[PDB]
Amino acid sequence: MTEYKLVVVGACGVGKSALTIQLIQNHFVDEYDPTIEDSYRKQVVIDGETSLLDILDTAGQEEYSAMRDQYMRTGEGFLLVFAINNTKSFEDIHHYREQIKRVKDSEDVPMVLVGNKSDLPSRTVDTKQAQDLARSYGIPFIETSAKTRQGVDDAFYTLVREIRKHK
Ligand SMILES: *CCC(=O)N1CC2(CC(n3nc(-c4ccccc4)c(-c4c(Cl)c(C)cc5[nH]ncc45)c3C)C2)C1
Ligand SMILES: Nc1nc2c(ncn2[C@@H]2O[C@H](COP(=O)(O)OP(=O)(O)O)[C@@H](O)[C@H]2O)c(=O)[nH]1
Ligand SMILES: [Mg+2]
């Protein structure tokens, strides 16, 4: 059984925890302590291959550390999450992508851009803007809602597919 180390990154409040919990416990969490950073495991079947997903839901301090570089370097694929109603969270994506490229020492790291909270009517980031950004990066873009489950399996499964292509 192949194991894939996935990491969920993005600003505070974009839905990193709710997305991870929807995949693991099949339930929408309306609150989850922003300081809890943990890894969650799930056995899935993607394209006939049984796989173990080991997902790191980043949280805690918004600060630089060499220790965090070391464990972020272990990730094989990264979900760059923003919320469709938070322009600042979209403007932060470049920052997360470049920090990941820095620790992986590569310009080619498996990533997926994720536009979360797709169920809300308060949109500030146009879908075409997110598609444009994903195209400029050469990565897939998935619209998700941790509330309704829209795109949740797609975001993680697409990331596993990106890793398979890299490997
Ligand atoms: C509200 C709590 C929450 O959900 N958080 C997510 C977050 C921001 C995450 N984070 N911030 C940094 C960072 C901070 C300052 C300078 C540079 C980076 C990182 C980070 C990343 Cl993405 C990499 C690849 C390497 C690294 N080394 N130190 C920090 C850092 C992260 C994950 C935590 C608070
Ligand atoms: N409506 C809606 N709210 C979401 C969604 N995902 C997360 N939230 C809410 O946004 C807030 C932040 O979510 P959370 O998972 O804690 O964000 P994190 O800081 O990135 O881990 C919580 O109140 C969540 O319930 C979503 O897809 N739709
Ligand atoms: Mg969280």
Swiss-Prot record:
Q: Which Pfam families match?
A: Ras
Q: What is the recorded phenotype of mutating residue 40 to A?
A: Decreased interaction with MAPKAP1/SIN1
Entry-listed glycosylation sites: 35
Recorded catalytic reaction(s): these are: GTP + H2O = GDP + phosphate + H(+)
Tell me how this protein sits in the membrane.
Lipid-anchor
* Compartments, as annotated in UniProt: Cell membrane; Endomembrane system; Cytoplasm, Cytosol
Keyword annotations: Acetylation, Cardiomyopathy, Cell membrane, Cytoplasm, Deafness, Disease variant, Ectodermal dysplasia, Glycoprotein, GTP-binding, Hydrolase, Intellectual disability, Isopeptide bond, Lipoprotein, Membrane, Methylation, Nucleotide-binding, Palmitate, Prenylation, Proto-oncogene, Ubl conjugation
**EC number per UniProt:** 3.6.5.2
Oligomeric form and interacting partners: Interacts with PHLPP. Interacts (active GTP-bound form preferentially) with RGS14. Interacts (when farnesylated) with PDE6D; this promotes dissociation from the cell membrane. Interacts with SOS1. Interacts (when farnesylated) with GPR31. Interacts with RAP1GDS1. Interacts (active GTP-bound form) with both SHOC2 and PP1c (all isoforms) to form a tertiary complex; SHOC2 and PP1c preferably bind M-Ras/MRAS, but they also bind K-Ras/KRAS, N-Ras/NRAS and H-Ras/HRAS. Interacts (GTP-bound form) with MAPKAP1/SIN1; inhibiting K-Ras/KRAS activity.
Q: What is this protein called?
A: GTPase KRas
> What is the species of this protein?
Homo sapiens (Human)
What would be the name of the gene that encodes this protein? KRAS
